[PDB]
Design a protein around this ligand. Structure first.
Ligand SMILES: [Cl-]
Ligand SMILES: [Cl-]
Ligand SMILES: [Cl-]
Ligand SMILES: [Cl-]
Length: 274
């Protein structure tokens, strides 16, 4: 269709403004049509990987190994300094938090210490990786927690995904494929109750649009930003849903240009829905 040719051409033009490695995957969830750009290429996930982490944790809740109300005793030693951590900022001497609260801090606020606490609770990155692969999500790797990612610039590239692999997870979240209704509802709740990335998926969508998403961001080193990502499920006015993954990687352009790629592509798909 000329409608989809125009959409595809505009995705390419928007992506080109990042002058980098751009991956896009979208699906109209109820109908099943998809569009991709570099959909099988590999991209650093950064904090997008807190989504597969959360699925692995909630799977253990469903299986009876964990409980959302179980108390996590967080010591000062587990709260690494320097790293982004609303938990540490509020509880610099440690605290007790319910598992549901650690999950909310990790997914909704991207807490790096919450992330590493959750990885440790489920058996580490190796456990989460094999669990995700067991779901049939092959084109993803989870090798490093946040502490290890901070140790050297290159480590983030070992936690990679293709746009389609992240799309797979979004489709599975949308349909409740991996999690009980209660655990899946909770995951969607915490993915919706975030204020991160207002200029990404949300940048040019109506402010009251419902968007369940997770951002990922690297620092900028030698002018290169490894990752500027957003992935989520958008509810359209007609009640149907779009799954949208945009990874902007390995570019020297500034933050406004990088985030604008995500925002403009997302609004393009919103406007292209009928
Ligand atoms: Cl680990
Ligand atoms: Cl895959
Ligand atoms: Cl390095
Ligand atoms: Cl600039």
């Amino acid at each position: 269709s000329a409608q989809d040719n125009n959409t595809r051409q505009k995705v390419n033009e928007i992506a080109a403004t990042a002058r980098g490695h751009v991956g896009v995957a979208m699906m109209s969830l109820e109908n099943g049509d998809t569009m991709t750009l570099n959909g099988n290429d590999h991209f650093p996930m950064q904090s997008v990987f807190k989504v597969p982490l959360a699925i692995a944790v909630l799977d253990q809740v469903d299986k009876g190994k964990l409980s959302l109300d179980q108390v996590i005793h967080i010591t000062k030693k587990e709260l690494l300094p320097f790293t982004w951590s609303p938990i540490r900022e509020k509880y610099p001497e440690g605290t007790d938090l319910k598992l549901r609260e650690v999950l909310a801090y990790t997914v909704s606020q991207s807490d790096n210490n919450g992330c590493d606490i959750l990885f440790n609770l489920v058996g580490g990155t190796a456990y989460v990786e094999q669990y995700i692969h067991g779901l049939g999500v092959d084109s993803m790797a989870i090798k490093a927690n946040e502490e290890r990612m901070a140790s050297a610039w290159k480590v983030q590239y070992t936690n990679w995904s293709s746009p389609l692999a992240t799309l797979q997870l979004l489709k599975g979240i949308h349909t409740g494929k991996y999690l009980s209704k209660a655990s899946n509802d909770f995951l969607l709740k915490i993915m919706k109750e975030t204020t991160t990335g207002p200029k990404r998926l949300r940048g040019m969508l109506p402010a009251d649009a419902v968007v369940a998403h997770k951002t990922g961001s690297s620092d900028t080193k030698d002018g290169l930003t490894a990752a500027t990502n957003d992935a989520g499920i958008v509810t359209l006015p007609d009640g149907s849903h779009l799954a949208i993954v945009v990874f902007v990687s390995d570019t020297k352009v500034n933050e406004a240009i990088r985030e604008g790629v995500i925002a403009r592509i997302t609004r393009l798909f919103w406007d292209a829905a009928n």
